[PDB]
Amino acid sequence: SDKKMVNGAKVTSWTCVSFSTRIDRGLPQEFCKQLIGMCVSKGMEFKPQPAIPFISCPPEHIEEALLDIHKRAPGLQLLIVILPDVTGSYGKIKRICETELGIVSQCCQPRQVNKLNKQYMENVALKINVKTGGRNTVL
């Protein structure tokens, strides 16, 4: 528990996309609700409402969904991405977000999201802080 945020970024524009078919339809909301609480307890500030409603769509709609989210939310500071159930799409997703559309994303495996492990969300929260412009350290 020695990893801390020196400076917690402030996120005003964020939302969540899920390419997972397997998970309960309430998990994206629940998972993001706790993750943000974990980001916030560690020093970040988050607007509690996403900038556009959460989206759930099939893995074959990756190109479409990402570009849709990007055009409807040009100011997005963060996209929380729930990855497809089968691995192999992560490179495509990062490429589209990071290189092609210019969107800061955090990708999360649906099987791990399902666990709602609080140490996993601690790890993700610190990853999100740096991606969003914050600073982390180890005490």
PDB file of C-alpha atoms in Angstrom:
ATOM      1  CA  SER A   1       0.000   0.000   0.000  1.00  0.00           C
ATOM      2  CA  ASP A   2       3.103   2.167  -0.428  1.00  0.00           C
ATOM      3  CA  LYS A   3       2.153   3.265  -3.942  1.00  0.00           C
ATOM      4  CA  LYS A   4       0.485   6.684  -3.768  1.00  0.00           C
ATOM      5  CA  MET A   5      -0.697   9.530  -5.978  1.00  0.00           C
ATOM      6  CA  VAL A   6       1.517  12.573  -5.364  1.00  0.00           C
ATOM      7  CA  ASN A   7      -0.956  14.533  -7.416  1.00  0.00           C
ATOM      8  CA  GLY A   8      -4.398  13.185  -8.337  1.00  0.00           C
ATOM      9  CA  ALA A   9      -5.562  14.182 -11.822  1.00  0.00           C
ATOM     10  CA  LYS A  10      -9.030  15.660 -12.294  1.00  0.00           C
ATOM     11  CA  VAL A  11     -11.377  13.896 -14.725  1.00  0.00           C
ATOM     12  CA  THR A  12     -14.512  15.689 -15.984  1.00  0.00           C
ATOM     13  CA  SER A  13     -15.134  13.803 -19.243  1.00  0.00           C
ATOM     14  CA  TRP A  14     -15.170   9.992 -19.112  1.00  0.00           C
ATOM     15  CA  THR A  15     -17.331   7.013 -20.058  1.00  0.00           C
ATOM     16  CA  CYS A  16     -17.309   3.245 -20.353  1.00  0.00           C
ATOM     17  CA  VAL A  17     -17.524   0.801 -23.243  1.00  0.00           C
ATOM     18  CA  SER A  18     -17.991  -2.915 -22.978  1.00  0.00           C
ATOM     19  CA  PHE A  19     -17.179  -5.440 -25.672  1.00  0.00           C
ATOM     20  CA  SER A  20     -17.892  -8.317 -23.293  1.00  0.00           C
ATOM     21  CA  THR A  21     -20.892 -10.538 -23.867  1.00  0.00           C
ATOM     22  CA  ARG A  22     -20.474 -12.730 -20.829  1.00  0.00           C
ATOM     23  CA  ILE A  23     -20.862 -10.294 -17.955  1.00  0.00           C
ATOM     24  CA  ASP A  24     -23.964  -9.262 -16.109  1.00  0.00           C
ATOM     25  CA  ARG A  25     -25.407  -6.085 -17.614  1.00  0.00           C
ATOM     26  CA  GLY A  26     -24.985  -4.302 -14.270  1.00  0.00           C
ATOM     27  CA  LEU A  27     -21.276  -4.975 -13.893  1.00  0.00           C
ATOM     28  CA  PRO A  28     -19.985  -2.070 -16.048  1.00  0.00           C
ATOM     29  CA  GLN A  29     -21.916   0.422 -13.876  1.00  0.00           C
ATOM     30  CA  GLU A  30     -21.008  -1.301 -10.632  1.00  0.00           C
ATOM     31  CA  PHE A  31     -17.334  -1.754 -11.595  1.00  0.00           C
ATOM     32  CA  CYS A  32     -16.929   1.848 -12.715  1.00  0.00           C
ATOM     33  CA  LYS A  33     -18.731   3.036  -9.589  1.00  0.00           C
ATOM     34  CA  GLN A  34     -16.214   1.315  -7.311  1.00  0.00           C
ATOM     35  CA  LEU A  35     -13.166   2.049  -9.514  1.00  0.00           C
ATOM     36  CA  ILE A  36     -13.889   5.784  -9.412  1.00  0.00           C
ATOM     37  CA  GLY A  37     -14.382   5.576  -5.634  1.00  0.00           C
ATOM     38  CA  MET A  38     -10.941   3.965  -5.486  1.00  0.00           C
ATOM     39  CA  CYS A  39      -9.428   6.619  -7.798  1.00  0.00           C
ATOM     40  CA  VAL A  40     -11.001   9.289  -5.600  1.00  0.00           C
ATOM     41  CA  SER A  41      -9.956   7.844  -2.227  1.00  0.00           C
ATOM     42  CA  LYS A  42      -6.368   7.885  -3.527  1.00  0.00           C
ATOM     43  CA  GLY A  43      -6.425  11.555  -4.536  1.00  0.00           C
ATOM     44  CA  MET A  44      -8.125  11.974  -7.917  1.00  0.00           C
ATOM     45  CA  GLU A  45     -11.249  13.979  -8.613  1.00  0.00           C
ATOM     46  CA  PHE A  46     -13.924  12.525 -10.901  1.00  0.00           C
ATOM     47  CA  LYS A  47     -17.212  13.857 -12.176  1.00  0.00           C
ATOM     48  CA  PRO A  48     -19.657  11.125 -11.090  1.00  0.00           C
ATOM     49  CA  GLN A  49     -21.676  11.279 -14.315  1.00  0.00           C
ATOM     50  CA  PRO A  50     -20.114   9.971 -17.528  1.00  0.00           C
ATOM     51  CA  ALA A  51     -20.004  12.455 -20.418  1.00  0.00           C
ATOM     52  CA  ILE A  52     -22.187  10.138 -22.535  1.00  0.00           C
ATOM     53  CA  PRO A  53     -24.178   7.046 -21.450  1.00  0.00           C
ATOM     54  CA  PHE A  54     -22.308   3.733 -21.132  1.00  0.00           C
ATOM     55  CA  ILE A  55     -22.258   1.621 -24.275  1.00  0.00           C
ATOM     56  CA  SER A  56     -22.387  -2.151 -24.609  1.00  0.00           C
ATOM     57  CA  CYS A  57     -21.933  -3.703 -28.033  1.00  0.00           C
ATOM     58  CA  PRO A  58     -20.579  -6.840 -29.735  1.00  0.00           C
ATOM     59  CA  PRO A  59     -16.805  -7.231 -30.269  1.00  0.00           C
ATOM     60  CA  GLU A  60     -17.344  -6.981 -34.056  1.00  0.00           C
ATOM     61  CA  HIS A  61     -18.472  -3.381 -33.528  1.00  0.00           C
ATOM     62  CA  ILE A  62     -15.080  -2.183 -32.150  1.00  0.00           C
ATOM     63  CA  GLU A  63     -14.149   0.194 -34.981  1.00  0.00           C
ATOM     64  CA  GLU A  64     -17.740   1.573 -35.104  1.00  0.00           C
ATOM     65  CA  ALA A  65     -18.220   2.039 -31.328  1.00  0.00           C
ATOM     66  CA  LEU A  66     -14.881   3.703 -30.698  1.00  0.00           C
ATOM     67  CA  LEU A  67     -15.352   6.193 -33.536  1.00  0.00           C
ATOM     68  CA  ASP A  68     -18.930   6.850 -32.421  1.00  0.00           C
ATOM     69  CA  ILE A  69     -17.870   7.565 -28.836  1.00  0.00           C
ATOM     70  CA  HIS A  70     -15.092   9.789 -30.086  1.00  0.00           C
ATOM     71  CA  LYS A  71     -17.363  11.935 -32.287  1.00  0.00           C
ATOM     72  CA  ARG A  72     -20.091  12.255 -29.661  1.00  0.00           C
ATOM     73  CA  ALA A  73     -17.518  13.108 -27.027  1.00  0.00           C
ATOM     74  CA  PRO A  74     -14.620  15.014 -28.620  1.00  0.00           C
ATOM     75  CA  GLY A  75     -13.557  16.164 -25.158  1.00  0.00           C
ATOM     76  CA  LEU A  76     -13.339  12.718 -23.490  1.00  0.00           C
ATOM     77  CA  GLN A  77     -10.506  12.675 -20.963  1.00  0.00           C
ATOM     78  CA  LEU A  78     -10.758   8.910 -20.391  1.00  0.00           C
ATOM     79  CA  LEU A  79     -12.464   5.835 -21.854  1.00  0.00           C
ATOM     80  CA  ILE A  80     -12.812   2.854 -19.594  1.00  0.00           C
ATOM     81  CA  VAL A  81     -12.807  -0.104 -21.929  1.00  0.00           C
ATOM     82  CA  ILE A  82     -14.117  -3.533 -21.018  1.00  0.00           C
ATOM     83  CA  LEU A  83     -12.324  -5.941 -23.384  1.00  0.00           C
ATOM     84  CA  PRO A  84     -13.955  -8.741 -25.385  1.00  0.00           C
ATOM     85  CA  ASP A  85     -14.242 -12.121 -23.671  1.00  0.00           C
ATOM     86  CA  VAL A  86     -11.743 -13.686 -26.080  1.00  0.00           C
ATOM     87  CA  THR A  87      -8.293 -12.112 -26.074  1.00  0.00           C
ATOM     88  CA  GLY A  88      -6.648 -10.864 -29.272  1.00  0.00           C
ATOM     89  CA  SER A  89      -8.374  -7.505 -29.794  1.00  0.00           C
ATOM     90  CA  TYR A  90      -6.316  -5.433 -27.320  1.00  0.00           C
ATOM     91  CA  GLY A  91      -3.759  -4.263 -29.900  1.00  0.00           C
ATOM     92  CA  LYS A  92      -6.532  -3.173 -32.246  1.00  0.00           C
ATOM     93  CA  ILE A  93      -8.284  -1.239 -29.448  1.00  0.00           C
ATOM     94  CA  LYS A  94      -5.177   0.579 -28.219  1.00  0.00           C
ATOM     95  CA  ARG A  95      -4.120   1.417 -31.755  1.00  0.00           C
ATOM     96  CA  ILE A  96      -7.551   2.898 -32.498  1.00  0.00           C
ATOM     97  CA  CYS A  97      -7.709   4.848 -29.263  1.00  0.00           C
ATOM     98  CA  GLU A  98      -4.134   5.975 -28.806  1.00  0.00           C
ATOM     99  CA  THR A  99      -2.922   6.414 -32.367  1.00  0.00           C
ATOM    100  CA  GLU A 100      -6.019   6.806 -34.527  1.00  0.00           C
ATOM    101  CA  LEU A 101      -8.692   8.748 -32.623  1.00  0.00           C
ATOM    102  CA  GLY A 102      -6.622  10.308 -29.849  1.00  0.00           C
ATOM    103  CA  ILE A 103      -8.402   8.969 -26.812  1.00  0.00           C
ATOM    104  CA  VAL A 104      -6.865   8.138 -23.466  1.00  0.00           C
ATOM    105  CA  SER A 105      -8.100   4.662 -22.636  1.00  0.00           C
ATOM    106  CA  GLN A 106      -7.851   2.155 -19.804  1.00  0.00           C
ATOM    107  CA  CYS A 107      -8.431  -1.447 -20.875  1.00  0.00           C
ATOM    108  CA  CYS A 108      -9.747  -4.040 -18.398  1.00  0.00           C
ATOM    109  CA  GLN A 109     -10.270  -7.780 -18.767  1.00  0.00           C
ATOM    110  CA  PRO A 110     -13.926  -8.828 -18.244  1.00  0.00           C
ATOM    111  CA  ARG A 111     -12.922 -11.822 -16.084  1.00  0.00           C
ATOM    112  CA  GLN A 112     -10.988  -9.512 -13.759  1.00  0.00           C
ATOM    113  CA  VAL A 113     -13.697  -6.837 -13.781  1.00  0.00           C
ATOM    114  CA  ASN A 114     -16.020  -9.614 -12.653  1.00  0.00           C
ATOM    115  CA  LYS A 115     -13.895 -10.242  -9.529  1.00  0.00           C
ATOM    116  CA  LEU A 116     -14.180  -6.615  -8.339  1.00  0.00           C
ATOM    117  CA  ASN A 117     -10.931  -7.201  -6.453  1.00  0.00           C
ATOM    118  CA  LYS A 118     -10.069  -4.028  -4.585  1.00  0.00           C
ATOM    119  CA  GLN A 119      -6.314  -4.477  -5.096  1.00  0.00           C
ATOM    120  CA  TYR A 120      -6.913  -4.799  -8.840  1.00  0.00           C
ATOM    121  CA  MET A 121      -8.814  -1.520  -8.774  1.00  0.00           C
ATOM    122  CA  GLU A 122      -6.045   0.039  -6.689  1.00  0.00           C
ATOM    123  CA  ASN A 123      -3.624  -0.899  -9.505  1.00  0.00           C
ATOM    124  CA  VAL A 124      -5.961   0.346 -12.247  1.00  0.00           C
ATOM    125  CA  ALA A 125      -6.636   3.586 -10.352  1.00  0.00           C
ATOM    126  CA  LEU A 126      -2.920   4.450 -10.252  1.00  0.00           C
ATOM    127  CA  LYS A 127      -2.591   3.530 -13.941  1.00  0.00           C
ATOM    128  CA  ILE A 128      -5.526   5.842 -14.665  1.00  0.00           C
ATOM    129  CA  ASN A 129      -3.958   8.711 -12.651  1.00  0.00           C
ATOM    130  CA  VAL A 130      -0.802   8.812 -14.763  1.00  0.00           C
ATOM    131  CA  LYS A 131      -2.707   8.398 -18.077  1.00  0.00           C
ATOM    132  CA  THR A 132      -4.856  11.388 -17.093  1.00  0.00           C
ATOM    133  CA  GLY A 133      -1.951  13.628 -16.162  1.00  0.00           C
ATOM    134  CA  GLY A 134      -1.490  12.840 -12.480  1.00  0.00           C
ATOM    135  CA  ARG A 135       1.719  11.860 -10.664  1.00  0.00           C
ATOM    136  CA  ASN A 136       2.395   8.666  -8.724  1.00  0.00           C
ATOM    137  CA  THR A 137       5.200   7.600  -6.360  1.00  0.00           C
ATOM    138  CA  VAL A 138       6.313   4.813  -4.004  1.00  0.00           C
ATOM    139  CA  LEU A 139       6.802   5.707  -0.348  1.00  0.00           C
TER     140      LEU A 139
END
